[PDB]
Structure formats: C-alpha cells, structure tokens
C-alpha cells in the first residue's frame, strides 16, 4: 500500500488538480463525477438540515470544491491534510494568490445549483472567511489533529481520503472512530469515496486505494459509533487510465 512518506515525496498537488478538478465542457468521466459530488454536497448542506457552528474537513488535499456549499451552512471551516505541500496549494487560493488554481468553472456550477442567489466573487469571499484554520492531519492517530485545541465540531467531512489513507479495514474502522473524537454526540459525518478500487493515478505516479464494497463501508461506520441516516451508490467510474473503481458512495452518519 502507498505509504504516508510516498504522499510526502510524490503526491503532486498541481498535477492532481489538473487531472481531476479542471471542470471541462467536454464531458469527462472526471467532470461527471465532480458534477455528481457537487450536486450531492449541495443536497446535503443546502436542502437537508446539515448546518452547525464548526465543520472540520479531513484529507482536504489541495481542493476547495467540497467546501463551496458547506460554507452556506457552517460559520467556521477547518481544513486539514497529511501533506504540507497540499496545504501550501490550498492556502494560495485562501490568500487569492494570482498563482492559485483556477476554480471558477466549479464556483460557477455551485453558484448555479444554489439558484444564482450569488455571483462567483462573493461565493468565493464566503468560503475564504469561513476557513479559520489550516492544519496538519493524520487519520491513523487517535488524535488526528495532534495537540491542537478545537471545540467539538458539529460535522466531519472526508472526500476521497480514507480510501487513500487506510491500508485495510481495521485501519479504516479505526480512522472512523478517531474522526468521531472531533465530533459532538449526534454530530454529522459526511464521506464521499470510491467503491471496489485498488489504485488511482496522479500523472505517471500510482497511489493505492482500499478496495471496499457497500457492505464493508456501512459495517465499519456502525462499528465506529455511528448510525447512518442516508447511504447512496452511483455506478459512474473514473476514466480507465486513472482508476479501477465500480462507483462512488456518499453517506450522512451521526455519532451515537
Ligand atoms: N493518513 C493520512 N491522514 C490524513 N490524510 C492523509 C493520510 N494519507 C493520505 N492522506 C491525504 O489524503 C488525500 C487523498 S486525495 C483527496 C483530496 C480531496 N479531499 C478530494 O476529494 O479530491 C491526500 O491529500 C493525502 O495527502
Ligand atoms: C480523486 N481520487 C480519485 C480516486 C479514484 C479511486 F478509484 C480511488 C481513490 C481515488 N482517490 C482516493 C482513492 C482520489 N483522491
């Protein structure tokens, strides 16, 4: 399995954003999946009653797409990744660096799902002010943020991280409990990840992915102290040149 040092030495954040998050008129498997993720995260943070004071995002990578509907429903967003270089990319955007990744196609798509109430500029300034803390993170540790003081959060979010981060089910189920340590009892857990998948590519470079099915996922979340409110499985896959998944699951859970 890809080790944490392989993420520190070889995970290229600029390449990663270019292969997966360049929203494209040409209807790429990647654009479709991104459109799938974007309409689910709107559904969860805007239509459903998923709102709170504090949202922690775990495995943020170099991406801000998972936070664009979230910032409508939370006052404070803390973003985390195990890879510093990833957190360095994220911050470029937060600072509105003119060398930050261009997200606006995505910001336009979301500004649309939310019924054009706001322009691109002012949905971007909602997210920037919402993100209060950018922190090192590790889902294998029982205190994944280490020493860092944080109030109990109302929602933990993890997009396409825990498949990347966990060599096996025991580790996977351990990681779920550990994110619960950051959550108020009856606090929301949101996970969007790949189903039946062993790898994904960032350019020439190969990264493992925990190969796990519908049953295994939903079993681990119960084990970890959660009750599932909704669970969803789309059959849409990544390009065959990039990933070997059979689909993607989304879930909203609660902490017993
Ligand atoms: N043990 C670990 N703890 C925390 N993050 C980890 C980890 N192992 C890998 N990661 C991070 O998990 C991420 C997987 S890529 C996911 C990026 C983004 N959330 C998206 O949905 O596209 C990488 O940024 C990698 O650095
Ligand atoms: C963007 N993707 C693509 C992808 C496809 C896949 F099948 C499995 C995994 C990924 N990962 C994590 C695990 C990502 N971070």
Numbering used by the authors: 5 to 260
What does the paper say about this structure?
Nicotinamide N-methyltransferase (NNMT) is a metabolic regulator that catalyzes the methylation of nicotinamide (Nam) using the co-factor S-adenosyl-L-methionine to form 1-methyl-nicotinamide (MNA). Besides regulating Nam availability as a substrate for NAD+ biosynthesis, NNMT activity also influences the SAM:SAH ratio, or cellular methylation potential, and regulates DNA and histone methylation, thus being an important node in the control of cellular metabolism and epigenetic regulation. The nicotinamide binding pocket of NNMT is an attractive target for small molecule inhibitors. Here we describe a novel series of tricyclic compounds that are potent and selective substrate-analog inhibitors of NNMT.
Thermal shift assay was performed to assess the binding of tricyclic compounds [(6) = JBSNF-000028, (8) = JBSNF-000107] to hNNMT prior to co-crystallization studies. Both the compounds were found to be tightly bound to human NNMT in presence of SAH (molar ratio of enzyme:SAH:compound ~ 1:5:10) with ~ 10 °C shift in melting temperature (Tm) whereas ~ 3 °C shift in Tm was noticed in the presence of SAM. Based on these results, crystallization was carried out with the hNNMT protein in the presence of JBSNF-000028 or JBSNF-000107 and SAH at molar ratio of enzyme:SAH:compound ~ 1:5:10. The asymmetric unit contained four identical copies of human NNMT molecules (named A, B, C and D) and overlaid within 0.4 Å RMSD among each chain. For all further descriptions below, protein chain A is considered. Both co-crystal structures overlay within 0.2 Å RMSD. In the active site, demethylated cofactor, SAH is bound in the cradle formed by loops (141Cys-Asp-Val-Thr, 85Asp-Tyr-Ser, 63Gly-Ser-Gly, 163Thr-Leu-Cys, 69Tyr-Glu) originating from the Central domain. JBSNF-000028 or JBSNF-000107 is surrounded by Tyr-20, Tyr-24, Tyr-25 (from N-terminal domain), Leu-164, Asp-167, Ala-168 (from central domain), Ala-198, Ser-201, Tyr-203, Tyr-204, Ser-213, Tyr-242, Ala-247, Asn-249(from C-terminal domain) and SAH within 4.0 Å. Tricyclic compound (JBSNF-000028 (Compound 6) or JBSNF-000107 (Compound 8)) is planar in nature and bound below hairpin structural motif at the nicotinamide pocket and stacks between Tyr-204 (from Hairpin) and Leu-164 (from central domain). NH-group attached to saturated 6-membered ring interacts with side chain of Tyr-20 (from N-terminal helix), main chain carbonyl of Leu-164 and very proximal (~ 3.2 Å) to S-atom of SAH. Fluorine attached to unsaturated 6-membered ring interacts with side chain of Ser-201.
